[PDB]
């Protein structure tokens, strides 16, 4: 089972979240961290597509 259905970067966004193979990412934080680099910076894995 995954976590508690929260972005894990803002704690406050629970709506159509995306999984990062270990947690639930938000729709905007994913784009920001992807525009930054190729790493995840919150679980240290390759980010999804």
């Amino acid at each position: 089972l995954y976590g508690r259905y929260n972005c894990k970067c803002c704690w406050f966004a629970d709506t159509n979240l995306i999984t990062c193979n270990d947690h639930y990412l938000c729709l905007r934080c994913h784009q920001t961290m992807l525009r930054n680099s190729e790493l995840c910076h919150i679980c240290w894995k390759p980010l999804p597509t």
Partner: protein, 1603 residues
């Protein structure tokens, strides 16, 4: 008559030394009658005891039993109508009196109670005997056994046995017989059925007002119906109207309120940190003045140190002429230096140690040259031979060790000194007592001036700490508004660059707060930098920490590297905040930062109390708090504010802000003022009792209350239990409602809660109190004075030198020993010592034998100088006196002229107040029923025989009030007598057992604490409702009557008997506790009597003389002292909280589980089936908790994002590390008695710090700071020393021995010799494991030494003479070779290998840090290193030869070769032997992987993870007790017999070969006994205490691979 007749025969072995002995024995032996026999025998035994005790003190036994009035009237002495007291032994001589009262008590309780009842009765007589008479010294001789020096110490117990047997055979009341037998046994818990428990017609109303509504049998359905109806009433009556206590978050309004309360807007202060605070301005001045811009000095420093050393011997019995002589020596040395080498007075003085027309002298003093020559011009013409006697006194009766060949006997030529004075003209300091801004805008400075600011702060703080070091018994030559022209002020120096130095001028000594003036000196041009006012003992943290703070700030800033542009604004702000915190330490900054922590906690969550923002505001004074509050609030707003893109990485933001709020740990917690803190503690203690209306005044202290006292007590008891379940008015006043308590008990009994009454392991298995904190109580002072006076009187069998004062140093803690024992005292300790000396001297003077004091306090010892000007005392003491003074100093000081000698010695010196006091003292300006006549010799009348509902016939449970130092606000503290301590111990053990039977409470059970931690972690990870409830006023609100009711309603069923234990003793002790008496501090009474508004001061003045007398004892209903009933309070809280969880589960269909720690709790609620529909439940829970005595604090929070319990914050995914807490803990608590213990302490702290993922770049800096602290004290660097630098993340799987081994391996570069030693150690280990298995024979090789042991091991494995000469060459210096460094450190008043001490500690069961370190540095400079005598450390280190044979230069001043220590070879030991011992012991400890060769290997700084140690033990891991004792007895019989196991009764198991001959413990226990820094046996008997290490992935990739 079997024993009756044998008594007269057995007592025949008595020696009639005195006449009364025989006169009583002839009457006892010649009278056989059972009624006058027991009294005669008891009185004869008592007379023997008291006669021995009297003759022991050169006494005169009182054979007439006459009072003191008539014993004074025998001589010519007027009776001032003293109280009638019968003394046991008297001794009158001249005009002094010695009264001694002796007794005997066998148990400690009655011994203390009798001593504290006889000493007070003796002290109450001196106030009436001194007003119109003579002085007296009281002696109290108590003996805990009937032994003496007249019989062979074997007949006394036989006589005792015969007497008790005759008494129990036939008698002739009921309790006079139970006490006599109890007072003749030797030694003898609960079950006090021997007591009587007689009623007193007052306990009827107690039981009628305590147990009328308590039933405890209510059914289960009725509770459900009542709870349902109560909820239905609550929902529509007090919640839908808006009278709740909790509300939603609404972050925007939170930020608005923060900006309103923190960022001041109506203030006139500017936005510049350097303009408001003075110390920051001085730091800025010095920094931006320094940044942007030779045998003479050594000779001067050497002779100055020699003068400073000769000043410490006080070989002149005076202070003025001593300073004149030292000044003469110094000026003659200056004029002898200025004879030639013209480039010395301007080159090596201006750039060295000199200032404008001022020279440096002894005692860190600075003296004007013109004043110096003017004072040297005195003492000549009127005393022409002054230079002659001083020159011929430094040879005979003198150390005769001096280099003063010509600088001493020279006559000071004044013309050359005037030439020097006219060379450099006056530019003296100004000593400034009591708008344009140009300050470079800190935010836009380079990265080099800020480090310079930190370095300058470090330097000035070190100078302040050193200013605290100046001698106390020091008086300036001449004495002294807004500006004072300094001429004779003290000065300290600190170096900053090649040419410029900095001076710090002050005028006072001690540890008080002062005003300092900071100046600079570039090339002799003395400039001005500023002035400020501070307390020196609050600046110890930055003393050497200028690289630790920079590193922690740097990495705390790098935490925010997710946005390039956020850290660039928060870096300088954070650094400036740290600087402003360090330059202004105060309690208000601590309080504000704690409030910030709670604000962040409430911001992250969703529901919070409605009274929060009223707990965050602090009234800022001094205009220096305003800037720090603005900085902190600005940082909070910059990190938290925003509309949408303000939470991109919230874990990092929460961590940053929590560590920012935890910066309150940098400021010390050391009570800025003692009297103010005691006053505040008394306010906080007595305010709620006066608000409630039950605080009585001074009781009888015997268990007897008047009618009004019991009336008010019962009224308070009724008011406590008179709260209803509907009225919403009483939700903040103490008290409990009986209906809900009955529900709780009735539901607890019928196995419904999560705890039950199914317990196992049946639980029934001389200080004064009104002054807590004083360094010397009245009792100790009077005892010391009496002891000294009695000793001096017994010696006079007159004349006396100052050696008597030496006696006062012998019992409180040969000029060298006197100087070593006097210098270890603190300022107020010096004052108390002066008081004691004065009292003893006046007493001895009496033994040898202005009007405003008679009406006022007649004691001239406390005549204040603030009631009189200075000129009047200065002129009146120098008037005409013919027979008061005498010519000369009279060093021999014969008895009979001691007062004249003291007056003369005080008048010759500068101070005149002592002369005036001595003139006042010298001018006489101070002028057969066996129940009543049998309880006076040795009958322990005060023993517990019958008790009532309020006392125990032996007191009323007296306590004492004090405080405890904390970060935010101080805590309360109660210190009681011995009897009350025993009773509290009984009840606490009972309740601790009962709670140990329970499950959910976690206060003294670490497994339940770990279970709570796991539950909380899983809740925060899953998304359950976590409610962190901290309760307010838990101590001063609870009452023992609540526990009484709870226990009366309980049953506590036995495990397998089901007997319903009767709790009579527990309830009796609780009733005794309910009527306890608390004594108020005497300082508060004095401050409120001598004489802003205060409630407690109002109560004091209202109760001072209106109702009765000045309050000294306060009894009330509700105290429940903090730290007294801790366990019973925990039990009550557990029961009530389980009831509340049951009610919540019943009403709101949720699943709660709660953990409690007796003051705060955490409740984890799992809800069915976002979190806006749970406000009603929380408000209802708070209402019900208020219906019990469990008020909730506004700091409590409810949410689903963060959880707190015992200061341990758990968040989504991980846990916040709290870096700054551990760093500030490491920089503090430098408690040093030896460098080894300091190294070990900082090692443990750094280990527990790096366990919480701090860094490996900040621990090396703490290590270097501790190394520099050791080096600065004068001890020098050692191979082991403090913890190691350049460490790695291998604090896991590594003990202290392993990092010591790493340090020693790092000393050697190519690790060749260490490799050889390690290979030999591996050979020895493999040979002791199997093959040629060894035995205890190696023990006989270890106890010899270092050289022989190492060469024996080497020739055991295999070697030759080449290895003998090679390995044994590397030597280091061990000052602790013939013992340990002798030193008297800053301890409290009134006062062999270390493995033995550790085992003794295992078998059995207010001071500043800056002052302690100053005392340590001061003691490490005297004669400390022992030999054969004692000597200095620089004397030892000056005997080493600078050979430099390219083997002693690989690590200078640490490792030498053999021939470099030929001069001093007693202190020289091989380091390879210590390396071998450490390698072998680490092999014993944590595996055999410590033999391989170290190889080096071939990540965003935020990738953390948890790792476990990888140790493998080969020492039979269990390794319990009773194993080291057996091996110690085997190998060291004499050392096992003495110093070990006198307090041991289970030798049988430890002797019957209980798992004897351990695998490796046989040899790895002798290496620990001789090495004074190995210490593994004290480590094997201890847990890891960490068990897991959080570390970043960047460090785990750079470690060393040793396998």
């Amino acid at each position: 008559d079997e024993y009756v007749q044998e008594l007269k025969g057995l007592i025949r072995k008595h020696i009639p030394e005195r006449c009364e002995f025989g006169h009583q024995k002839v009457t006892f032996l010649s009278q056989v009658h059972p009624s006058p026999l027991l009294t005669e025998g008891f009185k004869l035994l008592s007379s023997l005891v008291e006669l021995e005790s009297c003759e022991a003190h050169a006494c005169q036994a009182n054979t007439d039993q006459r009072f003191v009035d008539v014993i004074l009237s025998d001589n010519g002495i007027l009776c001032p109508t003293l109280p009638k007291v019968i003394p046991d032994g008297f001794k009158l001589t001249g005009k002094t009196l010695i009264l001694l009262e002796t007794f005997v008590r066998v148990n400690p309780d009655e011994f203390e109670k009798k001593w504290k009842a006889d000493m007070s009765k003796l002290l109450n007589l001196k106030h009436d005997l001194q007003k119109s008479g003579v002085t007296l010294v009281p002696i109290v001789d108590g003996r805990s056994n009937y032994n003496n020096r007249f019989v062979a110490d074997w007949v006394i117990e036989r006589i005792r046995w015969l007497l008790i047997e005759i008494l129990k055979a036939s008698k002739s009341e009921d309790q006079e017989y139970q006490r006599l037998i109890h007072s003749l046994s030797n030694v003898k818990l609960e079950n006090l059925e021997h007591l009587k428990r007689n009623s007193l017609d007052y306990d009827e109303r107690l039981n009628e007002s305590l147990f009328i509504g308590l039933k405890g049998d209510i059914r289960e359905s009725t509770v459900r119906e009542e709870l349902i109806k109560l909820k239905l009433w609550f929902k529509d009556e007090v919640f839908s109207k808006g009278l709740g206590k909790f509300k939603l978050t609404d972050r925007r309004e939170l930020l608005e309120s923060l900006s309103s309360l923190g960022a001041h807007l109506d203030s006139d202060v500017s936005s510049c940190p350097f303009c408001n605070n003075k110390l920051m301005e001085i730091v800025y001045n010095v920094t931006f003045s320094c940044v942007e811009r030779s045998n003479i000095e050594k000779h001067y420093l050497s002779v100055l140190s020699l003068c400073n050393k000769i000043k410490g011997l006080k070989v002149f019995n005076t202070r003025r002429n001593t300073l004149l002589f030292l000044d003469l020596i110094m000026v003659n040395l200056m004029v002898d230096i200025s004879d030639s080498c013209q480039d010395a007075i301007e080159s090596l003085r201006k750039s060295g140690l000199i200032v404008g027309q001022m020279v440096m002298l002894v005692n860190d003093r600075v003296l004007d040259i013109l004043e110096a020559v003017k004072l040297i011009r005195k003492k000549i013409g009127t005393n022409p031979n002054w230079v002659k006697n001083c020159s011929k006194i430094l040879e005979r009766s003198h150390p005769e060790i001096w280099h003063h060949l010509s600088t001493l006997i020279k006559q000071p030529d004044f013309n050359s000194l005037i030439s020097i004075a006219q060379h450099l003209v006056s530019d003296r300091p100004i000593m400034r007592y009591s708008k344009i801004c140009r300050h470079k805008l800190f935010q836009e400075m380079s990265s080099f001036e800020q480090m310079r600011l930190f370095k300058t702060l470090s330097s000035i703080s070190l100078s302040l700490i050193n200013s605290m070091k100046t001698s106390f018994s020091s008086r300036l030559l001449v004495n002294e508004f807004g500006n004072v022209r300094l001429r004779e002020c003290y000065a300290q120096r600190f170096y900053l660059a090649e040419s410029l130095v900095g001076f710090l001028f002050y005028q006072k000594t001690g540890e008080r707060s002062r005003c300092y003036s900071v100046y600079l000196s570039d090339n002799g041009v003395m400039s001005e930098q500023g002035s400020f006012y501070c307390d020196p003992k609050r600046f110890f943290l930055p003393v050497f920490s200028d690289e630790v703070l920079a590193g922690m700030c740097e990495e705390m800033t790098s935490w925010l590297d997710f946005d390039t542009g956020l850290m660039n604004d928060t870096g300088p702000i954070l650094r400036l905040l740290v600087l402003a915190i360090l330059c202004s330490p105060s309690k208000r900054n601590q309080t504000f930062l704690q409030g910030l922590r709670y604000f962040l906690m409430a911001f992250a969550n969703q529901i919070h109390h409605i009274d929060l923002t009223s707990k965050l505001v602090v009234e800022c004074k001094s205009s220096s708090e305003v800037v720090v509050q603005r900085l902190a609030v600005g940082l909070f707003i910059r990190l938290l504010s925003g509309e949408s893109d303000a939470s991109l990485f919230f874990s990092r933001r929460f961590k940053y802000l929590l560590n920012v709020s935890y910066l309150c740990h940098l400021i010390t917690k050391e009570t800025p003022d003692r009297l103010t803190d005691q006053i505040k503690c008394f306010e906080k203690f007595i305010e709620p009792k006066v608000k409630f209306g039950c605080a009585v005044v001074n009781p009888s202290l015997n268990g007897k209350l008047t009618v009004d006292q019991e009336d008010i007590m019962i009224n308070g008891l009724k008011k406590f239990f008179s709260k209803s379940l509907r009225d919403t008015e009483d939700v903040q006043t103490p008290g409990v409602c009986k209906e809900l308590l009955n529900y709780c008990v009735s539901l607890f009994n019928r196995g419904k809660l999560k705890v039950s009454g199914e317990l196992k392991n049946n639980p029934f298995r001389i200080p004064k109190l009104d002054e807590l904190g004083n360094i010397l109580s009245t009792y100790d002072k009077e005892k010391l004075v009496s002891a000294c006076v009695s000793s001096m009187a017994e010696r006079f069998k007159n004349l006396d030198p100052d050696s008597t004062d030496y006696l006062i140093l012998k019992n409180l803690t040969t000029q060298e020993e006197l100087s070593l024992m006097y210098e270890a005292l603190t300022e107020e300790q010096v004052e108390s010592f002066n008081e004691i000396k004065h009292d003893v001297q006046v007493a001895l003077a009496k033994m040898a034998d202005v009007s405003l004091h008679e009406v006022k306090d007649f004691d001239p010892d406390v005549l204040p100088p603030e009631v009189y000007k200075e000129l009047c005392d200065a002129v009146y003491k120098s008037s005409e006196k013919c027979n008061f003074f005498l010519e000369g100093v009279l060093d021999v000081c014969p008895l009979g002229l001691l007062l004249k000698n003291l007056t003369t010695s005080s008048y010759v010196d500068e101070e005149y107040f002592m002369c005036f006091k001595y003139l006042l003292i010298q001018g006489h300006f101070d002028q057969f029923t066996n129940a009543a006549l049998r309880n006076l010799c040795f009958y322990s009348e005060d023993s517990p025989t019958e008790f009532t509902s309020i006392s125990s016939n032996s007191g009323n449970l007296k306590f004492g009030l004090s405080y405890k130092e904390q970060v935010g606000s101080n805590r309360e503290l109660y210190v009681g007598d011995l009897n009350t301590k025993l009773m509290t111990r009984l009840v606490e053990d009972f309740s601790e057992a009962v709670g140990n039977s329970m499950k959910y409470t976690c206060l003294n059970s670490e497994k339940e604490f770990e279970r709570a931690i796991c539950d909380m972690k899983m809740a925060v990870n899953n998304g359950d409702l976590s409610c962190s409830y901290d309760h307010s006023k838990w101590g001063p609100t609870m009452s023992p009557a609540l526990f009484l009711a709870l226990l009366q309603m309980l049953e506590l069923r036995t495990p397998v008997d089901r007997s319903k234990i009767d709790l009579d003793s527990v309830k009796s002790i609780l009733k005794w506790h309910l009527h306890k008496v608390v004594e108020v501090p005497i300082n508060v009474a004095e401050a409120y009597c001598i004489g802003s508004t205060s409630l407690s001061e109002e109560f004091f003045h209202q109760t001072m003389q209106l109702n009765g007398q000045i309050p000294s004892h306060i009894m009330s209903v509700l105290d429940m002292g903090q730290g007294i009933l801790h366990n019973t309070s925990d039990l009550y809280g557990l029961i009530t909280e389980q009831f509340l969880c049951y009610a919540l589960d019943l009403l709101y269909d949720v699943i709660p589980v709660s953990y409690t720690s007796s003051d705060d709790q955490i409740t984890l609620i799992k809800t069915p089936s976002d979190a806006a529909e749970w406000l009603e439940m929380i408000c209802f829970h708070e209402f019900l908790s208020s219906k019990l005595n469990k008020f909730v604090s506004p700091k409590s929070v409810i949410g689903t994002f963060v959880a707190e319990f015992k200061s341990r914050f758990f968040v989504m995914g991980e846990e916040t590390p709290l870096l700054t807490k551990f760093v500030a803990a490491a920089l503090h608590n430098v408690k040093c008695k030896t460098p080894t213990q300091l190294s070990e302490t900082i090692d443990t702290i750094c280990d527990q710090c790096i366990a919480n993922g701090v860094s490996t770049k900040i621990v090396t800096r703490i290590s270097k700071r501790v190394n520099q602290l050791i080096r600065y004290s004068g001890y020098g660097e050692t191979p082991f020393g403090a913890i190691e630098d350049q460490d790695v993340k291998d604090w896991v799987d590594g003990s202290r021995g392993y990092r010591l081994q790493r340090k020693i391996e790092a000393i050697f570069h190519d690790d060749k010799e260490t490799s050889f030693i390690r290979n030999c150690a591996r050979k020895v280990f493999n040979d002791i494991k199997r093959g040629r298995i060894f035995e205890e024979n190696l023990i006989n090789l270890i106890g010899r030494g270092g050289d022989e042991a190492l060469t024996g091991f080497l020739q055991y494995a295999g070697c030759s003479e080449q290895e003998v000469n090679r390995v044994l060459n590397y030597r280091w210096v061990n000052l602790s070779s013939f013992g340990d460094l002798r030193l008297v450190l800053r301890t409290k008043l009134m006062t062999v290998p270390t493995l033995i001490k550790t085992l003794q500690s295992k078998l059995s069961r207010q001071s500043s840090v800056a002052s302690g370190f100053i005392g340590f540095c001061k003691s490490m400079g005297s004669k400390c290193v022992r030999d054969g005598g004692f000597l200095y450390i620089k004397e030892v280190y000056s005997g080493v030869s600078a050979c430099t044979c390219e083997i002693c230069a690989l690590k200078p001043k640490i490792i030498y070769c053999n021939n470099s220590l030929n001069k001093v070879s007693q202190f020289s030991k091989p380091i390879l032997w210590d390396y071998f011992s450490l390698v072998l012991t680490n092999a014993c400890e944590l595996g055999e992987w410590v033999f391989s060769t170290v190889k080096e290997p071939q990540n965003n700084q935020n990738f953390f993870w948890a790792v476990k140690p990888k140790v493998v033990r080969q020492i039979e891991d269990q390794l319990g007790m009773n194993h080291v004792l057996q091996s110690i007895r085997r190998n060291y019989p004499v050392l096992f017999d003495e110093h070990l196991t006198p307090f041991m009764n289970d030798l049988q198991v430890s002797r019957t070969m209980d798992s004897g001959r351990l695998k490796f413990l046989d040899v790895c226990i002798a290496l620990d006994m001789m090495n004074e820094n190995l210490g593994i046996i004290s480590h094997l008997l201890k847990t890891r205490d960490n068990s897991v290490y959080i570390v970043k992935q960047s460090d785990c990739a750079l470690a060393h691979i040793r396998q």
